[PDB]
DNA sequence: GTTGGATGGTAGC
DNA sequence: CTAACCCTACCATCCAACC
């Protein structure tokens, strides 16, 4: 069982570089401008030139301009990156039909039937990197291992423009030696709980009682972590089926005023419903980000598919329910559809 | 006990 | 307006319905 993983390098900014080659070699920051004030919003991503100075995903645009005023700031053009991505996903399809598109910039290939061993896998990695480079001028990082998790870790260890194999023996080693915080699915909350327990390595999860581990991090995470330490993790590559689709937007200013919010909600519904594309949802959720960045939601599941009109009426009601039950002003409003027929 | 709906937490993009 | 966007996957917990 061999898995090949592809993660595109500094994706959004790299795409801007390919569109505009004069940008290459200098700092580029791709931004989400919220319109609340001059330069309000956050960085979506930046090239390596900009990361050298601390500019990266998630920081505020003004914070990036403070620490890097002369960089090139461009607005996130989501659709453009999606088009480049799709073309790249189709190139990858010509290498294995058995492909899991896992996000805007990454995919898993099961190549067990394409190659005999890690060596040939490494070589396909080379051919894949070159082809994506011929056709789209985009550099990627390849990770190759026995499963999804270690193929992801391998690519993380090689970024940028790298390729890395983690073979059966280094999986053993990594189980004993890799900091557990570095395992995909282990964020800052789980990391801290593990530290208190004195669980630092995957191997450590085999020397603690399940109930005690499950009591701290929850069942599924405990199962997942143990499965990896036992080297019995084998989740198959599966065709990507979206479970929810939606849209969220930032308001000019914070409001508790239904009439001042409505236009944004409706903008989010039109865009959401368009992205459904023949998919018919049975659930709608209105999502509100409050003044203090708390995420709050109200939803409804129908026994039947929701029409655009039903979505219009229900989300207004659902918004009012948020206003009824939470006293805070709202800052971002959106809508999410799930449970596709 | 099972399934699943409402809502929130965590994670990573 | 004074920093904090976009999008999706998955799970936990608190309850209700089933039977
Ligand atoms: N709006 C927004 N977009 C994000 C965020 N994080 C990532 N993205 C988008 C932009 C990225 O280019 C793309 C892929 O995310 P990655 O984590 O793989 O980062 P990226 O490819 O830019 O860096 P890479 O060289 O792996 O390190 O997803 C975020 O916090 N907000
Ligand atoms: Ca990625
Ligand atoms: Ca990437
Ligand atoms: Ca981590």
């Amino acid at each position: 069982g061999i898995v090949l993983f592809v993660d595109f390098d500094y994706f959004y900014a790299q795409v801007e570089e390919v569109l505009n080659p004069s940008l290459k070699g200098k700092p580029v920051v791709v931004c989400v401008f919220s319109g609340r004030f001059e330069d309000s919003g956050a960085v979506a991503t930046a090239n390596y030139e900009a990361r050298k100075f601390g500019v990266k995903a998630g920081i505020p645009i003004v914070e990036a301009k403070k620490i890097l005023p002369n960089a090139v700031y461009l607005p996130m053009r989501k659709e453009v990156y999606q088009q480049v991505s799709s073309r790249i996903m189709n190139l990858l399809r010509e290498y294995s039909e058995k492909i899991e598109i896992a996000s805007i910039d990454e995919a898993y290939l099961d190549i067990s039937d394409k190659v005999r061993d890690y060596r040939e896998a490494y070589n396909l990695g080379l051919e894949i990197k070159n082809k994506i480079l011929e056709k789209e001028k985009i550099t990627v990082t390849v990770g190759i291992s026995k499963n999804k998790v270690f193929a992801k870790i391998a690519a993380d260890m090689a970024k940028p423009n790298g390729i890395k194999v983690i073979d059966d023996e280094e999986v053993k080693r990594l189980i004993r030696e890799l900091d557990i915080a570095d395992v995909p699915g282990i964020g800052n909350i789980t990391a801290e709980k593990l530290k208190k327990l004195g669980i630092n390595k995957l191997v450590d999860t085999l020397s603690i009682e399940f109930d005690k581990l499950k009591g701290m991090i929850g069942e599924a995470k405990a199962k997942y972590l143990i499965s990896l330490a036992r080297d019995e993790y084998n989740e198959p590559i599966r065709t990507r089926v979206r479970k929810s689709i939606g849209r969220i937007v930032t308001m000019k200013r914070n409001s508790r005023n239904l009439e001042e919010i409505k236009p944004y909600l409706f903008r989010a519904i039109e865009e959401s419903y368009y992205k459904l594309d023949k998919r018919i949802p049975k659930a709608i959720h209105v999502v509100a980000v409050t003044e203090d960045l708390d995420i709050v939601s109200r939803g409804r599941t129908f026994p039947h598919g929701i029409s655009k009109e039903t979505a219009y009426s229900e989300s207004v009601k659902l918004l009012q329910k948020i206003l009824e039950e939470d006293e805070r002003k709202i800052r971002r409003i959106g809508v999410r559809f799930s449970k596709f027929i």
Side-chain angles (χ1 to χ4, degrees), chain A residues 5-9 105-107 139-143 152 155-156 159:
Chain A
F5 172 73
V6 186
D7 196 323
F8 313 155
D9 298 328
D105 87 323
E106 75 209 307
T139 72
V140 309
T141 292
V142 172
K152 207 198 224 184
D156 292 344
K159 280 184 190 184

Side-chain angles (χ1 to χ4, degrees), chain A residues 46-211:
Chain A
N47 61 16
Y48 286 75
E49 281 78 19
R51 302 194 195 176
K52 288 270 194 316
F53 296 95
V55 179
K56 43 153 209 299
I59 71 167
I61 295 162
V62 287
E63 189 168 286
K65 277 176 193 256
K66 207 224 301 167
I67 67 192
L68 252 194
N70 302 333
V72 171
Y73 294 77
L74 304 162
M76 182 184 69
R77 296 192 287 168
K78 187 53 174 300
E79 314 88 299
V80 165
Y81 323 135
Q82 188 57 73
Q83 283 156 353
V84 175
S85 189
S86 294
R87 287 198 308 266
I88 298 169
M89 298 313 167
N90 293 332
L91 290 184
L92 296 177
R93 244 177 277 263
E94 288 282 327
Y95 289 97
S96 174
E97 343 64 67
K98 211 161 141 32
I99 178 173
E100 182 177 327
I101 294 154
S103 76
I104 187 68
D105 87 323
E106 75 209 307
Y108 297 92
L109 285 65
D110 180 341
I111 52 162
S112 310
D113 300 318
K114 301 294 181 184
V115 303
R116 209 161 320 195
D117 60 28
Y118 281 125
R119 210 186 40 79
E120 283 183 12
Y122 175 88
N123 296 344
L124 205 78
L126 290 184
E127 282 176 22
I128 286 168
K129 282 169 74 64
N130 302 347
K131 196 72 148 168
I132 298 175
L133 194 61
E134 304 186 354
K135 298 279 200 185
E136 297 299 323
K137 310 263 172 265
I138 290 282
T139 72
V140 309
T141 292
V142 172
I144 291 145
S145 192
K146 71 200 288 176
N147 69 39
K148 287 198 273 181
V149 178
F150 286 97
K152 207 198 224 184
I153 297 157
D156 292 344
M157 292 174 166
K159 280 184 190 184
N161 183 29
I163 174 153
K164 177 150 166 62
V165 166
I166 301 181
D167 72 7
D168 278 16
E169 281 301 306
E170 221 208 345
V171 172
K172 318 269 216 188
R173 196 185 66 82
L174 284 175
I175 278 160
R176 286 180 276 110
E177 292 186 8
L178 189 69
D179 175 344
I180 201 142
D182 284 3
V183 185
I186 308 301
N188 294 142
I189 309 306
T190 317
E192 299 318 289
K193 287 169 170 184
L194 294 170
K195 285 294 199 192
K196 297 168 101 299
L197 284 177
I199 291 182
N200 302 288
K201 306 290 144 85
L202 276 160
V203 72
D204 293 341
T205 66
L206 307 183
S207 315
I208 173 163
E209 279 219 1
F210 180 64
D211 276 348

Side-chain angles (χ1 to χ4, degrees), chain A residues 184-252:
Chain A
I186 308 301
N188 294 142
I189 309 306
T190 317
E192 299 318 289
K193 287 169 170 184
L194 294 170
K195 285 294 199 192
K196 297 168 101 299
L197 284 177
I199 291 182
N200 302 288
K201 306 290 144 85
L202 276 160
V203 72
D204 293 341
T205 66
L206 307 183
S207 315
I208 173 163
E209 279 219 1
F210 180 64
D211 276 348
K212 200 192 291 94
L213 182 53
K214 167 179 179 285
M216 218 61 37
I217 67 167
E219 199 187 334
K221 270 183 175 82
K223 287 264 265 288
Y224 165 80
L225 290 187
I226 285 158
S227 182
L228 290 150
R230 289 188 135 140
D231 205 351
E232 280 160 16
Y233 180 97
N234 218 353
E235 291 295 284
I237 280 59
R238 31 187 72 204
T239 304
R240 174 81 173 278
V241 179
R242 280 134 153 88
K243 274 146 196 48
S244 68
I245 279 161
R247 172 81 174 151
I248 190 182
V249 298
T250 309
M251 289 181 268
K252 223 62 70 54

